[model samples]
Target: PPKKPKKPGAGATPEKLAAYEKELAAYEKELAAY
Candidate 1:
């Protein structure tokens, strides 16, 4: 696993959460290139 932390605030709405996850998906791919 990437050991990435969850979003810091509980204020995450589905729209924001989905967008965050999309970014995370990209990030994880880069991180896994190690």
Candidate 2:
């Protein structure tokens, strides 16, 4: 199956979700710096 969203943890808690989102957001932000 194709990965709809590649991320760690299943968002069992807000903490996990925040960190996961932070990672994704940070990656995008960094890429946009080009």
Candidate 3:
């Protein structure tokens, strides 16, 4: 699937990006395990 373009806040700090990535990864893993 094509990746969604990052929105205007795409350049968020590394900490913010890390948090978002962690949450997204958790969501994806949960769905996969379902």
Candidate 4:
């Protein structure tokens, strides 16, 4: 029986998510000084 292994985070969606969060935080922090 060949069990299909779960592919864990094999995409750039996490990268995109992280970039969005990090970049947005940096920009917003600078802009609003929050």
Candidate 5:
């Protein structure tokens, strides 16, 4: 059997996605600075 792809916004709200992206960007920036 094959796995199904998630629908757009399937498990996350826009706010949650935005928060995740922001946090990831911050982490990358910190790593770059180090």
Candidate 6:
């Protein structure tokens, strides 16, 4: 039921990348355990 906004691209700023990475980490963890 989760929808990721988007993948961070080369043009993405560090702040955005940090947020994405944070979310990516959780999503990865769930998917890993799933």
For this target, which candidate reaches the highest TM-score against the unseen true structure? Answer: 6
Q: Write the per-residue lDDT of candidate 1 for residues 1-34, one digit (tens) a residue.
A: 3546366358788877887787688668768874
Off by over 4 Å in 4: 1-12
Model 4 clashing residue pairs (backbone):
none
Worst 10 residues of 5 by lDDT: 1-10
Output the worst ten-in-a-row residue range by lDDT, candidate 2. Answer: 1-10
lDDT of 2 by residue, 1-34 (tens): 2223357655447777787677767767766763
Worst 10 residues of 4 by lDDT: 1-10
Model 6, runs deviating above 4 Å: 1-5
Give the Cα lDDT of each candidate: 0.70, 0.62, 0.61, 0.56, 0.59, 0.77
Candidate 1: deviation at residue 3, Å?
14
Sort order, TM-score high to low:
6, 1, 5, 3, 4, 2
Better candidate by TM-score, 1 or 2: 1
RMSD list, candidates in order: 3.8, 6.1, 5.6, 14.8, 9.6, 2.1
- Give per-residue CA lDDT, model 4, range 1-23, as digits (tens): 22223333555488666876666
Off by over 4 Å in 2: 1-6, 9-11
lDDT of 5 by residue, 1-34 (tens): 2222233366678876777667666666766776
Model 1, TM vs. native: 0.55
| Residue 32 of model 3, lDDT score | 73
Model 5 residue 29 CA deviation in Å: 0.3
| Candidate 2 lDDT score at position 5 | 34
Q: How many pairs of residues collide in each model?
A: 0, 0, 0, 0, 0, 0
TM-score of each model, paired residue for residue: 0.55, 0.48, 0.54, 0.51, 0.55, 0.62
